[PDB]
Structure 1
């Protein structure tokens, strides 16, 4: 019932009770753990209980649990549901729900900042142009000339599933990927397909190594449309090393604003299918994953070459030596250009502090170890030595099928 989690580097022991309020499933069972698996409409009868769950926690959070207001709102929503077969969140609820969905994202290491989320209510939106306007405003607000601010823009909630809003891009800002004759790939391999759907839509690709993709926005169910983000609104950082002058020649750059746009925000049973959100990068995401993953920019060899390291034998750890340098470069560039960014050491230390805060103020903190521990230097960051309990709480952010695999043109 009352689970305990130990930190093996400090011996600190936290007790978890928050998991008891868990509602969703984990993919795991008593006979099998699926902890490392990436991916393990509602009826009036399904909806009301969810709304109640939320409202009860919402009112409890504002110290008015079982108040007239609580009961009243509870009744009002109840009636609205039985009638409209759905409901609308007050603004106070939308904000609390979005913040808590971030608070509950077990895979996010940057949650110590959860309560500072800026919420942009775009529930009054009705067209791709409208969505494009909202997104440009989000980008400018969050980028803030390099002094990044976390934010989320919430489009109209789902109704019949045939009127859903969706941002086809996986992130507001990403580089294109094209399959060349060589069989190899130009640009970002992860976006090879989307890069094609755009073209399949009319996008004139500059066919470069770092071409900012165009937004493909879908509103009210209609087919999606393209829009190019004002270049002046896309902050970029040219990647250079603080010692290897040749580094600049590698021709590398990345965008400063990471903004996941393909997820689904769930609040009180209501589903928001278009809810792009952004914060700021942890160095390793770019330097380790985007730059060194074999199926991404896969740039380790080149950097190793330029460093003239013995690539004859894996035991010389050239891949490792280079990995470190590349990552030092990213953090150095961003910092040099005063663009917000956090290193994995500082980010992981903050998460540990945040976990302690959450354990003493909330009785727990769902966390997915597999995602929290950085892709490099795992054990020299404190989270590696931190036992974590993963469970699903609502409100939450959930994965959802790529629209192009569901859209009925």
Structure 2
């Protein structure tokens, strides 16, 4: 019945939710792997315990634990796992499972919103075109004219393994990355291998900077196909500073909608290999990681110059100073456009408040300190000072291999 302390407010909370934890973390009694980025077909025997566990907590949630309805649904799913060696989720069960996959995502600082999630049931989808249509309506709904709304679209679950629905993009909206004749890189270096796959499958690249990538959609295990998101559905924010008018000359912009598409949603032992989900951006993901990561857009070089900073000396903190301006500007631009965004102080304060609620009415909140603390100004945000216990609850979002490493291809 462990305790976690906050070393800024002296607040203690008691965690018992970790007792319901099931999966393994990577750590042992003699080694901690909490800074490792990714540490490590199904059968019908394994499937009923997972189904039972999920069903027991779902009916526990609607305040009908063990009622006739719960007992009949247990027997019903049991027999469906006899008949088909799989089963199907109720609409209500799918919405509960998705909302709790988010709720349980220990690397997510935005979970105070977890119960406000819009679930789009695309389990009737059969083709890549159908996926494109579903994905388009997700983008339009979640963007909502810049008044962004959280959403997830859930495609058919894995069955045999070789019939998988997969979005090959890592995010629904990403900027292209092309290498150069002189060896360097234009666009987004993260995506250079994906940008090349698109071209290998027929993409005709407008080889510039902020070129939105096309979708690569694989349906029912078939080879994936290219589709272009109507550019009117792709909302973008131009980045200006509220002081420095040379900022516009920098010519930077980002897309409004963060939408992860490469993860796996697990519910009651069922695996949804395509489940794109979207929220809104925290400022630092664009301004610190996207723009100033050394292997991403890498703009500290220029923003420092155009401020005339002492770049000769490492200890002038020219890099730090240019970093704060960039994030004031990303924020400023998004807000003056009514496009939803959150600064890393408001987001981290909300997560402390979210943590308090979870410990009260749930007995804990799995949390990954390495990922919750923002990538700048860490100790002036309250989560730096907050002990967190990390553990794996289900339903959950999991990593999965890139599909071009697994897909027994064909044509």
Q: Shared topology, TM-score over 0.5?
A: yes
Superposed CA offset, 1:222-243 (max 9, x none): 0000000000000000011110
> Matches of 2:155 and 2:98 in 1, distance apart?
12
The alignment's C-alpha RMSD in Å is: 0.4
Structure 1 residues 161-201: Cα deviation after superposition (integer angstroms, max 9, x where no partner): 11110000000000000111111111100000000000000
Distance in 1 separating the partners of 2:196 and 2:99: 35
Q: Distance in 1 between matches of 2:9 and 2:314?
A: 34
So what's the TM-score if we normalise by structure 1?
Answer: 0.99
In structure 2, C-alpha distance between the alignment counterparts of 1:63 and 1:146, rounded to whole Å: 37
Aligned to 1:224: 224
Q: CA deviation at 1:258?
A: 0.3
CA apart distance, 1:272: 0.1
Cα deviations by residue, 1:380-404 (Å, 9 ceiling, x for unpaired): 0000000000000000000000000
Q: Per-residue CA shift, 1:117-174, capped at 9, x if unaligned?
A: 0000000000000000000000000000100000000000000111110000000000
Structure 2: distance between partners of 1:145 and 1:244: 28
| Structure 1 residue 66 displacement after superposition | 1.0
CA deviation vs aligned residue, 1:299-343 (integer Å, no higher than 9, x gap): 001000000000011111000000000000000000011100000
Q: Within 5 A, what are the aligned runs for 1:91-106?
A: 91-106=91-106
For 1:228-274, what per-residue CA distance to the aligned partner results, in whole angstroms no more than 9, with x for missing partners?
A: 00000000000111100000111100000000000000000000000
Matched, 1:3 2:2: yes
2:21: which partner in 1? 22
- The superposition leaves residues 41-66 of structure 1 with CA deviations (integer Å, 9 ceiling, x where unpaired) of 21111000000000000011111111
How many Å apart are 1:369 and its aligned residue? 0.2
Distance in 1, Cα, partners of 2:405 & 2:36: 21
For 1:288 and 1:126, how far apart are their aligned partners in 2? 39
- Is residue 211 of structure 1 aligned with residue 202 of structure 2? no
SS in 2 for 1:116: coil
| TM-score, with length taken from structure 2 | 0.99
Give the Cα–Cα distance (whole angstroms) in 2 for the partners of residues 70 and 182 of structure 1. Answer: 65
- Report the 3-state secondary structure (helix = DSSP H, G, I; strand = E; otherwise coil) of the residue aligned with 1:175: coil
Give the corresponding residue for 1:36: 35
Inter-partner Cα distance in structure 1 for 2:162 and 2:45: 21
Task: Tell me the CA shift for residue 211 of structure 1.
Answer: 0.2
CA distance, structure 1, for counterparts of residue 318 and residue 209 of structure 2: 25
Moved over 6 A (4+): none
Identify the residue that residue 78 of structure 1 maps to in structure 2. 78
Which runs of 5 or more structure 2 residues have no equivalent in the other structure? none
SS at 2:37 equivalent: coil
Matches within 5 A, 1:171-182: 171-182=171-182
* 2: CA distance, partners of 1:173 / 1:207: 17
The CA distance in 2 between the partners of 1:178 and 1:73, in whole Å, is 52
SS at match of 2:232: helix
- Equivalenced residues, count: 408
Q: CA deviation at 1:366?
A: 0.1
SS in 2 for 1:153: strand
Output the CA distance in 2 between the equivalents of 1:222 and 1:56: 36
Counterparts of 2:57 and 2:265, CA distance in 1: 17
Query: Secondary structure of the equivalent of 2:306?
Result: helix
| Structure 2 match to 1:55 | 55
Aligned mates of 2:142, 2:177 — CA distance in 1: 25
Deviations 1:11-48 (A, max 9, x none): 00000000000000001110000000000121111000
- Take 1:22 and 1:176, find their aligned partners in 2: how far apart are those partners? 39
CA distance in 1, matches of 2:242, 2:214: 33
SS at match of 2:190: helix
Q: Distance in 2 between matches of 1:301 and 1:310?
A: 12
Distance in 1, Cα, partners of 2:341 & 2:306: 26
Q: Secondary structure at the match of 1:56?
A: helix
Structure 1: gaps spanning 5 or more residues: none
